[PDB]
């Protein structure tokens, strides 16, 4: 039984270390490109809710580093979902299933990857996209995101441009 995915994905993990620069905390853990390997990986690593504070997971397409500075991200941005543990785990897994299952219709090429940040101030789940200048694309992606994660209409999601994060939302939903 082998079910190939459209894309090959890499899980990255960031463990907080106050004596390292940000990029030096980031490690590429494993790549996968089948449904079977997706579940093998997910089922045998700590859930997002079980990560220590300051830790991150990133799931990005093969060849895209989960950095603003990556050529694939530099002109891009993210949809941001703020939380405030089962809800966080749910947001993360629903998002992973939506991206590896290619559930963003004709806009899959604009998906770079997903991010979960575990933080005392409030956990964050984000979807990084390729081109912050395409409001039409990003809006549709945002609508699928809210639908797949069962986010209430009253929770207003922000689309943030990476160039701004590196230095106010471009879109709100």
């Amino acid at each position: 039984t082998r079910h190939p995915l459209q894309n090959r994905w890499a899980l990255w993990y960031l463990k907080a270390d106050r004596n390292k620069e940000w990029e030096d905390c980031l490690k590429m853990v494993s790549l996968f490109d089948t449904v079977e390997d997706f579940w093998s990986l997910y089922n045998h690593i700590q859930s997002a809710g079980g990560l220590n504070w300051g830790s991150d997971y990133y799931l990005f397409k093969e060849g895209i580093k989960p950095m603003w500075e990556d050529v694939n991200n530099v002109q891009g941005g993210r949809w941001l979902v703020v939380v405030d543990t089962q809800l966080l785990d749910h947001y993360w897994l629903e998002l992973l299933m939506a991206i590896v299952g290619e559930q963003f219709d004709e806009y899959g090429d604009y998906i770079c990857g997903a991010v979960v940040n575990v933080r005392q101030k409030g956990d964050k789940v984000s979807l990084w996209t390729r081109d912050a200048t395409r409001d039409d694309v990003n809006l549709r992606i945002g609508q699928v995101l809210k639908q797949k994660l069962s986010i209430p209409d009253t929770e207003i999601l922000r689309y943030e441009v990476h160039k701004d994060s590196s230095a106010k939302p471009r879109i709100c939903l």
Partner: protein, 38 residues
């Protein structure tokens, strides 16, 4: 050529299973031992 390969939520959930591939175990243990549950 063929269409995009898609899996909706129900299909992925039904496919969800078991040991992991040894190559995967090796990789996780080597770079992120603290997240491994296996």
């Amino acid at each position: 050529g063929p269409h995009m390969i898609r899996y909706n939520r129900d299909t992925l959930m039904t496919a969800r299973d078991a040991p992991i591939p040894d190559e995967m175990l090796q990789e996780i243990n080597r770079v992120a031992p603290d997240i491994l549950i296996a």
